Ligand SMILES: *[C@@H](CCCl)C(=O)c1cccc(C(=O)N[C@H](C(=O)OC)C(C)C)c1
């Protein structure tokens with residue numbers, strides 16, 4: 001019993017974190033086999049941050065301009081290249097702790113664990129969701145760039161996020177491990193801002209099932225609704241549309257609780273229209289949308 | 303920016319988790335140097351669960367009755383003993399991954415990371431607080447017994463919790479690493495239940511400071527209060543009394559935000575008396591009390 005925002009165990013990732021310094025700029029890197037991955041803005045300085053041409057900046061560097069430290073061991077850089085917004089530093093040593101891994105790009109509404117790091121040293125681990133507007137609501141301080149987001153499936157680490165910046169609203173933006181940004185953000189100084197966001201409906205319904213599995217039932221009702229009528233309400237409250245595929249994905253949880261998906265949707269409609277009247281669900285007084293159906297099944301199966 | 307429930311990186315702990323089987327009962331153990339620690343109820347069977355005499359149960363076992371598996375390696379048990387409600391299994395191999403560690407008992411209102419494990423395999427990591435009534439609101443399924451709670455300070459792991467059981471309300475109880483229960487709970491089948499609980503005031507105030515540091519200011523006011531008047535309100539809302547030591551502990555956060563502790567207490571009094579009028583603080587619609595002053599300083603310093 002119980003329902004917590006749970007992250008994957010971080011040890012496999014911890015053994016990949018290093019510190020990358022170029023000039024007086026330092027940040028974190030990810031050491032896999034004989035390559036270190038980090039944000040390419042490590043080669044930029046305060047003077048070029050407005051319209052930097054990264055191809056020019058990199059052509060003017062050599063391997064000796066990069067210091068890579070893995071704990072108290074200095075790694076010799078033997079090559080450097082750029083891939084989109086990530087820098088690849090070839091080092092002369094393959095990381096002996098490299099896990100089985102994949103570079104996967106995630107979808108908005110999916111969750112992942114973040115290992116916050118500073119100066120190549122892990123500091124904390126927590127769960128995040130990619131928002132519909134392609135930002136993440138992280139916890140990151142100065143020096144956290146290069147920290148990564150990941151999921152683990154049977155000892156294989158699927159890396160999905162590298163941290164690059166903080167937007168003016170305090171939310172965060174970055175890229176996939178191939179250096180391609182999530183969202184319409186760039187690694188330079190502009191007035192860029194998070195676009196409008198929406199609530200991830202399928203996740204809210206998953207979490208209502210979690211709650212039922214954990215004995216919170218007060219929000220249930222005898223009613224049902226059609227998908228079309230439900231989605232009329234969703235649109236009114238800035239919730240994403242629910243699709244038949246979402247209904248199918250919720251099938252297992254529906255079957256375990258005996259509550260049809262469109263029945264739980266009737267409950268969600270009532271909650272949106274009426275609030276909670278002072279009650280809580282799984283210890284929250286608002287509707288939580290950063291648990292996927294998979295997250296719920298993982299933590300609630302028993 | 304940002305504020306998340308953040309756990310410590312779990313890798314140091316992950317390398318200590320093993321599986322312990324006695325008969326058909328299996329659970330998790332903690333392998334440090336050449337000792338494996340686990341709940342002593344692993345030696346109990348369904349027939350004895352009402353009034354087990356553990357001294358009798360253990361005298362009837364030998365080393366060969368315990369199977370310890372560390373990954374795919376079987377560890378040879380060469381001794382067994384009991385210490386309060388934990389079993390100590392001496393094995394013939396010192397864990398090469400043993401971190402620097404301490405066994406420390408924590409106070410109600412303090413937080414710690416939990417590494418949930420099944421069959422000696424880590425599954426997830428999350429933050430918990432020891433409640434004033436000595437329970438924890440965890441996330442644990444069948445097979446999670448023997449999972450541990452810990453804090454990490456400069457590479458030294460302070461273990462503070464081993465998981466033993468789930469109470470009827472779905473909250474959790476266990477012991478310290480010396481096998482002494484937190485709270486008035488026992489490792490046998492009774493009608494035992496969590497006692498009345500209260501909210502951890504000093505932590506709520508810490509979190510209000512976190513919020514101010516992260517730009518949530520709407521709940522601030524021009525008022526102050528005395529400690530005595532504040533505590534009259536606290537008692538009315540089932541909040542713990544605030545002490546001068548709590549005020550002193552909040553000194554740094556007060557100084558960073560420029561908001562005197564008793565000023566923030568005036569804000570808390572208004573929030574308790576009036577609710578939030580539909581607003582949120584750090585993405586919550588209720589007052590959060592599972593962050594200590596230390597947790598806030600760790601995550602907000604920048
Ligand atoms: C980024 C963490 C943000 Cl939450 C981080 O650790 C970091 C390290 C080093 C340098 C920067 C940085 O800000 N670089 C500039 C920038 O602001 O990005 C747009 C450059 C000069 C464009 C960040």
Ligand SMILES: *[C@@H](CCCl)C(=O)c1cccc(C(=O)N[C@H](C(=O)OC)C(C)C)c1
Nearest residue numbers: 346347351442444445446447467468490
């Ligand atoms: C406990 C996890 C609870 Cl959230 C766990 O993994 C476990 C493993 C093996 C056996 C038990 C168990 O329940 N034992 C009995 C009990 O219910 O504890 C009071 C014994 C027989 C007293 C739990």
